[PDB]
Design a protein around this ligand. Structure first.
Ligand SMILES: CC(=O)N[C@H]1[C@H](OC[C@H]2O[C@@H](O[C@H]3[C@H](O)[C@@H](O)[C@H](O)O[C@@H]3CO)[C@H](O)[C@@H](O[C@@H]3O[C@H](CO)[C@@H](O)[C@H](O[C@@H]4O[C@H](CO)[C@H](O)[C@H](O)[C@H]4O)[C@H]3NC(C)=O)[C@H]2O)O[C@H](CO)[C@@H](O)[C@@H]1O
Ligand SMILES: NCCCCCCOP(=O)(O)OP(=O)(O)OC[C@H]1O[C@@H](n2ccc(=O)[nH]c2=O)[C@H](O)[C@@H]1O
Ligand SMILES: [Mn+2]
Length: 273
């Protein structure tokens, strides 16, 4: 009996002040966000959103960044009127980071909770400066973080698909998900771009002003060295995507924590094979 939410949310306020020098307290954030339910889940109570969104954050040893993430995004995601949930996919162990494989785990585990039809993939240190930048899916793959301060407020190159993107369930299935074998920093986002193109898709983007985004300045994490094989790997995506992705994924979930502002899935994703 509830009516559809308006196509564009009327709650948005546009540009926002984003700051990272104060301390953050999640208990207080939870208090400020009383409609967010256990596990970081929220749907509007006045209308039915067509946007059923799981937001998936690749994670390890970035608790501080996450606190800022949750403090900023949660009010924004509720103003966007999304039926959404937050998933921090936390890599067990202390071997080489695998961002793309975590994202695949997130897609697959979130679908177990709820009929999501849209997946936002977001680095933990990226905060949107304009709530008009929609954190939901379009009829093409959607690059969200298009004007990052760290790149001078534009794309570093026109095929850049990193940072924060969104893919419908179908788009993500259509490319066999992300590659599993990009270990250490770099390239997996380019591979994902290649995949979308090889499947007849193109990148949808908001304008540069609306897609203005802040990156929390930070230094190198240990265990995520530039993958020296990345240039070779993005050159062969068309062949490798056929059998590297969802259809070749395994992993072992060690732990599932329902915090008030997010679900954290701690997962053993192994080492390079
Ligand atoms: C596929 C990929 O890497 N994709 C990522 C994309 O990469 C763009 C380049 O990033 C440079 O590092 C930047 C970084 O992007 C930025 O975030 C940060 O702020 O500044 C960094 C440093 O300026 C990176 O250095 C570069 O790597 C070099 O690429 C060249 C040409 O493509 C390649 O030939 C180099 O390899 C070396 O070549 C030299 C130079 O002649 C010597 O022969 C060396 O011996 C040889 O290794 C690469 N250099 C190095 C040091 O590896 C690109 O990776 O960027 C986006 C956004 O950052 C990512 O999200 C993409 O995944
Ligand atoms: N000028 C100083 C340069 C320091 C460069 C380090 C690379 O920085 P970025 O290019 O932002 O990538 P990144 O933030 O390290 O990795 C991307 C994302 O992967 C995640 N990630 C990466 C490594 C890690 O140990 N933990 C983690 O959670 C996190 O979501 C992060 O936002
Ligand atoms: Mn970063």
């Amino acid at each position: 009996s509830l009516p559809a939410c308006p196509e564009e949310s009327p709650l948005l306020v546009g540009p926002m002040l984003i700051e990272f020098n104060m301390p953050v307290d999640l208990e207080l954030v939870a208090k400020q966000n009383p409609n967010v339910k256990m596990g970081g889940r929220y749907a509007p109570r006045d209308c039915v959103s067509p946007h059923k969104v799981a937001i998936i954050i690749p994670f390890r040893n970035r608790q501080e960044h996450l606190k800022y993430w949750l403090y900023y995004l949660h009010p924004v995601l509720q103003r966007q009127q999304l039926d959404y949930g937050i998933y921090v996919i936390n890599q067990a162990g202390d071997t080489i980071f695998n961002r793309a494989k975590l994202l695949n785990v997130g897609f697959q585990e979130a679908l177990k909770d709820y009929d999501y039809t849209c997946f936002v993939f977001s680095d933990v240190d990226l905060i949107p400066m304009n709530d008009h930048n929609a954190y939901r899916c379009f009829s093409q793959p959607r690059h969200i973080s298009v004007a990052m301060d760290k790149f001078g407020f534009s794309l570093p190159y026109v095929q850049y698909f990193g940072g924060v993107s969104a893919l419908s369930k179908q788009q993500f299935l259509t490319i066999n998900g992300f590659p599993n074998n990009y270990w250490g920093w770099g390239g997996e986002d380019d591979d994902i771009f290649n995949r979308l193109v090889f499947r007849g898709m193109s990148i949808s983007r908001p304008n540069a002003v609306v897609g203005t985004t802040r990156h929390i300045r930070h230094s190198r994490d240990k265990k995520n060295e530039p993958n020296p094989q990345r240039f070779d790997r993005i050159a062969h995506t068309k062949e490798t995507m056929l059998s590297d992705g969802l259809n070749s994924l395994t992993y072992q979930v060690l732990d599932v924590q329902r915090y008030p502002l997010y679900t954290q899935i701690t997962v053993d994703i192994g080492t390079p094979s």
